Enzyme design. Structure first.
Site, PDB file in Angstrom:
ATOM      1  CG  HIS A 102      -0.572   0.216   2.486  1.00 52.66           C
ATOM      2  ND1 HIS A 102      -0.649  -0.756   3.465  1.00 52.66           N
ATOM      3  CD2 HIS A 102      -0.068   1.343   3.032  1.00 52.66           C
ATOM      4  CE1 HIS A 102      -0.185  -0.194   4.567  1.00 52.66           C
ATOM      5  NE2 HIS A 102       0.183   1.070   4.350  1.00 52.66           N
ATOM      6  N   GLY A 156       2.578   5.663  10.163  1.00 56.11           N
ATOM      7  CA  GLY A 156       3.977   5.611   9.760  1.00 56.11           C
ATOM      8  C   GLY A 156       4.688   4.344  10.196  1.00 56.11           C
ATOM      9  CB  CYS A 192       2.953   0.645   7.230  1.00 53.55           C
ATOM     10  SG  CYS A 192       1.189   0.788   7.568  1.00 53.55           S
TER      11      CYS A 192
END
Ligand SMILES: *C(=O)CCCCCCC
Ligand SMILES: *C(=O)CCCCCCC
Lengths: 300, 300
Positions: B41, B137, B139
Site C-alpha cells: 500500500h 507511519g 507500516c
C-alpha cells in the site's frame, strides 16, 4: 493506537556487551571506546577491594567480545565498578552518556549471560531505589539505558538480588542506587510507594486510547489530592508533576486535577470489573515522557 | 528471580530496517540480502496490479540511514512489495519467514521513517489480530522470534482496525485472518483467552515462588474444557498438554494438576490476591517464553 510495556531497541547496547572473567567468576562487561566497565565484585564476606585489586594484574582479566579476546592494558576501580582499559576501541560504540536517574524514572534493561543477550524489558527505578527486574545468576554487568536520538544514556548496571526478589545496582560510575553495598551483609529493600505522576500519565494514555469509563465531572485541588495520596501510599504530587503532565492534559482537554479526581475515586472504589488498558491494577511504570512518545509519536 | 514481559534483543532486526518512500508515502522496509520487503500500500494515493505496472524503479526511494540504496527491480507478492536493490545487506542475519498460529507470541520492532523506535512483546490473538502499539507511519515494522542466531520473521504491520487492534501479514504478504488492504469496513471477531499460555504463566509463577493457587486435585481435559468454554477460554488439547511437559517436569506439577488449579481461579477469582504482580490471568507468555526467561536462554 494501543499501549504496551515498550522498551528501547537494544541493538546499540548489544554491540557493547562482552564477557569478563576473573578466576572462577564470570559476568558481563560494557565495552565503550577502549574501556570495559563491570561490577568490581568480579575480583572478589568482608572484602578489601583496594588490596584485592593491587594484587591482581592486567593479564588476570579475561575479556571476550564474541569470539575475539581483548587485550587488557590497564585497570582501575571507580566506586563499585571496575574499568579495564583494552587495546582496541569498540568499533560499534554508539554516542553515549552516563546518567544517574531519579526514582520514578523508567529505563530498558538488556539482560545478558556470558556477554550474550537474553532479552529486553522496561522497568522503573522504584522510590525505595530497587528495580523489579528479571535476572538470574550471571546477569551481573547487564545494563539499563534510555535512548534519546541515537545517544544511549546508560543509567544502571546490575549487581545483586535482594531477599524479596527485587534488584539492586549502580549507575555506570559505580555508585549504588539506594543504601546497598557489594558485600555479603544483611540488606533489604525499604517500604516502597506508588509513583503518582506515572499513574496519572498512564490514565491519560488510557484516555488517548479510548478508555474513558473512569472519567468524572469533578476536579480536586493539589492539597486535597495529596491528603488522599498519603493514605494510599502514593508519592506526593508536586506543581512540577502537573507541569510535566502539560502535553497530556492539553491533548485530552482534561486538567491534571480533573484526572486526580478520577484517580481518587479509583483508589477509594476500584474498577468494579472494568479494566484500564487491559489492567485491573493502577500501573506506575510509565513516565509522562513515555506516554507522549508511545501515544503521540513524540521523538519519532 | 522476577518475571517481566520480555522481548527478544532487537539488534539483528534493527540492522535490517530501511525507509521506503513512494511519492508522498513513507513507511518501513525489511532489507535482507539484496531485497527490501514492504507493504504494497506504499504505492497508493485500488487495483494494485495496475498501480504497480505504472511505477518504475526510480519511483521507490530506499534509505538505510542517510545512505540511499538504488532500486534495480520490483515485484509484488500478495500484499508485500519486493524491491530488489543494488546493495546486499552486510548485516543480514540467518533468517526464515514463518507463518505463526494463534496463541504464539513475538517481539515487534516498531519503526518510523526506517528508524527503530521501540520493542515490545505481543501475541497473535485467536481472532487473528494483534494488540500492538502502532501509530501512523509504523507500516513495514516487523514481528519476529529468535532461536540461537536465526531470526524467524512472522509479521509485517499494515493496518489498524476500528477497536484499536492491528492486522498484518506474514513476510510472504498473506494476511493473518480475513483482513484485506483496502478501505472497507473490516472488524475483529470475538476474541478468546489463550489457555495454554495462561497455564504457562502459572508455571512461571510457581518457578518464582508464587504458589498459593495450587491445589492437590487433578482434573480431566473434558471437565476442564466445560469451565474453559464458560469463561471464554480456548479449549485445551493433548498437543497443549505435551507442549507444557517440560515446565510440568521442571516444577513437578502435572499439567492436569495445574488445570485443576486454573479451574478454581476461573470459578472463584483471585479474592484480592495477585500472581506475579497481576490481578488478572496473563495469556501472552507461551510455554517457550517461560523456559527462555526462567533459564536465561541467550542468542548468538
Ligand atoms: C540472593 O541470593 C537472593 C536471595 C537473598 C536471600 C538472603 C537470605 C534471606
Ligand atoms: C484506521 O483508520 C483506524 C480507525 C478505523 C475506524 C473506522 C470507523 C469505526
Amino acid at each position: 493506537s494501543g499501549f504496551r510495556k515498550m522498551a528501547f531497541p537494544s541493538g546499540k547496547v548489544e554491540g557493547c556487551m562482552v564477557q569478563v572473567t576473573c578466576g572462577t567468576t564470570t559476568l558481563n562487561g560494557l565495552w565503550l571506546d577502549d574501556v570495559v566497565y563491570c561490577p568490581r565484585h568480579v575480583i572478589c564476606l568482608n572484602p578489601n577491594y583496594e588490596d584485592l585489586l593491587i594484587r591482581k594484574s592486567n593479564h588476570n582479566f579475561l575479556v571476550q567480545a564474541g569470539n575475539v579476546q581483548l587485550r587488557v592494558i590497564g585497570h582501575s576501580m571507580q566506586n563499585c565498578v571496575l574499568k579495564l582499559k583494552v587495546d582496541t576501541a569498540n568499533p560499534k560504540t554508539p554516542k553515549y552518556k552516563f546518567v544517574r536517574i531519579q526514582p520514578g524514572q523508567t529505563f530498558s534493561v538488556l539482560a545478558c549471560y556470558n556477554g550474550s543477550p537474553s532479552g529486553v524489558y522496561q522497568c522503573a527505578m522504584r522510590p525505595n531505589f530497587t528495580i523489579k527486574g528479571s535476572f538470574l545468576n550471571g546477569s551481573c554487568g547487564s545494563v539499563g539505558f534510555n535512548i534519546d536520538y541515537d545517544c544511549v544514556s546508560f543509567c544502571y548496571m546490575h549487581h545483586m538480588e535482594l531477599p524479596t526478589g527485587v534488584h539492586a545496582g549502580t549507575d555506570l560510575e559505580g555508585n549504588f542506587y539506594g543504601p546497598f553495598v557489594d558485600r555479603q551483609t544483611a540488606q533489604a529493600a525499604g517500604t516502597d510507594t506508588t509513583i503518582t505522576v506515572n499513574v496519572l500519565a498512564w490514565l491519560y494514555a488510557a484516555v488517548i486510547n479510548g478508555d474513558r469509563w473512569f472519567l468524572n465531572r469533578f476536579t480536586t485541588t493539589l492539597n486535597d489530592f495529596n491528603l488522599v495520596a498519603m493514605k494510599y501510599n502514593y508519592e506526593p504530587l508536586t506543581q512540577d508533576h502537573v507541569d510535566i503532565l502539560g502535553p497530556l492534559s492539553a491533548q485530552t482537554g482534561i486538567a491534571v486535577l480533573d484526572m486526580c479526581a478520577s484517580l481518587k475515586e479509583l483508589l477509594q472504589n476500584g474498577m468494579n470489573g472494568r479494566t484500564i488498558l487491559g489492567s485491573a491494577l493502577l500501573e506506575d511504570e510509565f513516565t509522562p515522557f513515555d506516554v507522549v512518545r508511545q501515544c503521540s509519536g513524540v521523538t519519532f
